Structure formats: C-alpha cells, structure tokens
Amino acid sequence: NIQMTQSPSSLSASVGDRVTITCQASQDISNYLNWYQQKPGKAPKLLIYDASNLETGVPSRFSGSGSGTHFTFTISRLQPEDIATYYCQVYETFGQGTKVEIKRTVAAPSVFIFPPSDEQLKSGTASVVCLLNNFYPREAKVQWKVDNALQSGNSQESVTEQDSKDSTYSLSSTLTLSKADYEKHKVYACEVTSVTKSFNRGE
Amino acid sequence: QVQVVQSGAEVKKPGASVKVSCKASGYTFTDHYIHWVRQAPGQGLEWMGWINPYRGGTNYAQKFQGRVTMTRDTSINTAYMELSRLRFDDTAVYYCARPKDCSGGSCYDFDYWGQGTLVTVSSASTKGPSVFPLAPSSKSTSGGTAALGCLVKDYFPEPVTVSWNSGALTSGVHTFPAVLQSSGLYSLSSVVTVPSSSLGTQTYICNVNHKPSNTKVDKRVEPKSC
C-alpha cells in the first residue's frame, strides 16, 4: 500500500558536520514516521518516533521533522560512533536505508604477519594470516608471495566495518595451504599496496 | 528493565521449518503487540506480521501468508514465529519487536527489539569451531605495538562471537567478519593490538562462543620467543 523513498542510498561526511536524510511517502501518512539506527551486527534502535519526537535516551544531536509526505532526519554534528545504516518506516513499510560513513584523513596500515600455529599444523592444515591495522581509505590490495612466487586462489580477505572511534578500517588476508605444502616452502610474504611483511618458516 | 530476548541461531534444512522464540519481560506482556521483522544478509528490513498476545489474533504480510504462524504463551510471556517450507533465500536475521503506546489502533513505533536470530537455510550440518593461537612475535611487532589474536576455523553455521579477558579488554580489538571457505565452513580471526612492553606481563585470553554447537573456548595467547 505505502511505498517509502529514502535518499540518499549512502553518504560520506566528516566529523562534526550536518548529516541530512529524507524520506518521501507515497501517500499522506500524517506524522506517523519513525527513524532507526542500525549499527553493524546490531538490532535496529529507535531514534525518532512520530517524525518529530526524540525517543527516550537518544542523544539530542538526532532530530526529525516533516508531516504528510516529506520527512527529514538530521544529525546535527556527526560523531565517530554514529557509523550506521539509518532507516525510515511507516506502519509495515521500511525505507531502503542510508549508510552514513565518515571521511577522515589518510592513515597507513600497520602490517603484521602470523605464521601457522604448531597446534593447527598437527591437524594437517596451515593458515598464515596477514593483518592490516587501522588504515584509511578502505582501498587496499593484498597478495601473497611464497618463495617469491605469486599466489592466487588460496587466500581470503575480510574487512571490518569503520571503527567507532578513529573511523579506520582493518583488513585480514588468510593464505590457506596444506601442511605438506607449507613445509615444502620457506619464505612467506604479504605484499600490501607498497610494503612487505614476511617470515621464514623455520624461524 | 524492559527486555526482549530471542532464541539462539540455528541451521535448518531446506523444506523444513524453524520456530523462533521471543520472551518479553519488564512489562505487561498483553499490553503490547509483538511484530516480526527479518533482514537478509546485506539487505533492508522486511516486516513479516504481528500478533496480539491478549487474544492471539494475528496479521501476516501476504508474502508469508499460508507459510508463517505466530503464536504466544502468556504464562511464560513468550511469542513464537514459525516459518515452514524454508527456502534458500529465507536465510536471514529474524527480529521481534514491540511498539510504543498509542491510541490510534495501529502502533508501529518499535521501541524495543530482540537481539535477532540468524536462521541459515542449508543442508550442511552443525560443526564446532577449532581455535588456534595467533602468537605475538617479532613478525607481529611494529614500533612499540604488538599484535596478537585467535583464529576460529571450520565452524558452521554462523555466528561466533569473540571477547577478550571476558570483556575487560576492548580497546584495539578487531573481530573480522567470517569468510565462507571453499569447504563450506566459516572462519574468522579476532585480533588486538597492545603495547609490546606488556607481552609476558599482561595475560591475554580470547573467549570464543559458538552457540549453534553449544561450545565455548577460552584460550590464553602466549608470546613467542622469536
């Protein structure tokens, strides 16, 4: 029956400036629109109810306005912990969502490398982990060199969501090899673009 | 305090059914409706239906009509959402929520949400995780900062949660999202950066919880001597 049009789909803004999101209802819904904040891995949290009222406990920097068909959600000064996806909703219809992100200054990653544990080696498998810690922006290329030979198809990457405090990202690359293959080679290098972190298996 | 607590995540085979519980406390269970909203991975929120705990009346969205059943037991303040004939795309986090007080007859201001319940529609079986240390060493030390962690490998289904020192260690912690390996099992790493001068003095224990297999692992990560 009712269709919500949320805009923008995503935005990126600096700490302290004003974040603005709009929702348009297909029909007059009076002031019966709510706004939610969903942090990653979390349930949605009600922020604004009845389009204007601050839900109990919600910080005062969040506000909403509008009546009829046009509505607005605003964060007066964006905080580092406000990284989330925000939804508007009336009755049974949820808006498409707005992922707000923080623009911050460039930070180089801290690169660490972990050889496979002896405990895992007893199981017949080797996982070697390369860690990129607290970097911005999100773009990063990670590749594995085994005895200075390029690897492909045997590594998986995982990137955390933007940190709630320093607004940085972290990345992990996991090269998975059999126990026999791991003991068949010596030099294990992680190349991040460009810096290199490597170890020798026997050391 | 007003709390709404759901049952744990589980994996159900395609064509089977799942029933998620939703226990409310801290308020009169019959004074508020109980709604259900689901969220597929990386998608938006989808309203499923509501139930009135007083008399048991329900109202389902037509998408789930004939396939969903919402019941309640007032004697234990618990609502239930049963979804039958599970499809592969029924894989989602299922939430229950209650609305605020209102007098218009349609209260939809969801002020309290359950923690959610990840239902994975798959034929793969439940497997507990293996936890291995990510020991700090010279290769894990940059400047005056050292990195350590735990590797949680070969578990199914999601999720696993990781804490450090039973929650007392949160600063610098990064628990990466799980990756789906080619074997069909999940795997993730949880890491934390600490001063290198604390290695061998401070104790670092990772607490890995995998409720689907009812398995908890606490492992002390010890420094390497290289």
Author numbering:
A (entry chain L): 1 to 91, 96 to 197, 202 to 211
B (entry chain H): 1 to 52, 52A, 53 to 82, 82A, 82B, 82C, 83 to 100, 100A, ...
Copy out sentences from the published article reporting this entry, exactly as the authors wrote them.
In a double-blinded, placebo-controlled phase 1 human clinical trial, the recombinant, germline-targeting envelope glycoprotein (Env) trimer BG505 SOSIP.v4.1-GT1.1, adjuvanted with AS01B, induced bnAb precursors of the VRC01-class at a high frequency in the majority of vaccine recipients. These bnAb precursors, that target the CD4 receptor binding site, had undergone somatic hypermutation characteristic of the VRC01-class. The GT strategy for inducing VRC01-class bnAb precursors is rooted in the hypothesis that these antibodies target the CD4bs with a similar angle of approach to VRC01 and use the same conserved contact residues. To verify that VRC01-class mAbs elicited by GT1.1 do not just exhibit similar sequence features to VRC01-class bnAbs but also target the CD4bs in a similar manner and with the same atomic contacts, we selected five mAbs for further structural characterization.
Moreover, VRC01-class bnAbs have very distinct and targetable genetic and structural characteristics. Specifically, they have restricted immunoglobulin heavy chain variable region alleles (IGHV1–2*02 or *04) and a short five amino acid light chain complementarity determining region 3 (CDRL3). Finally, GT1.1-induced VRC01-class mAbs are structurally extremely similar to VRC01-class bnAbs. A subset of isolated VRC01-class monoclonal antibodies neutralized wild-type pseudoviruses and was structurally extremely similar to bnAb VRC01.
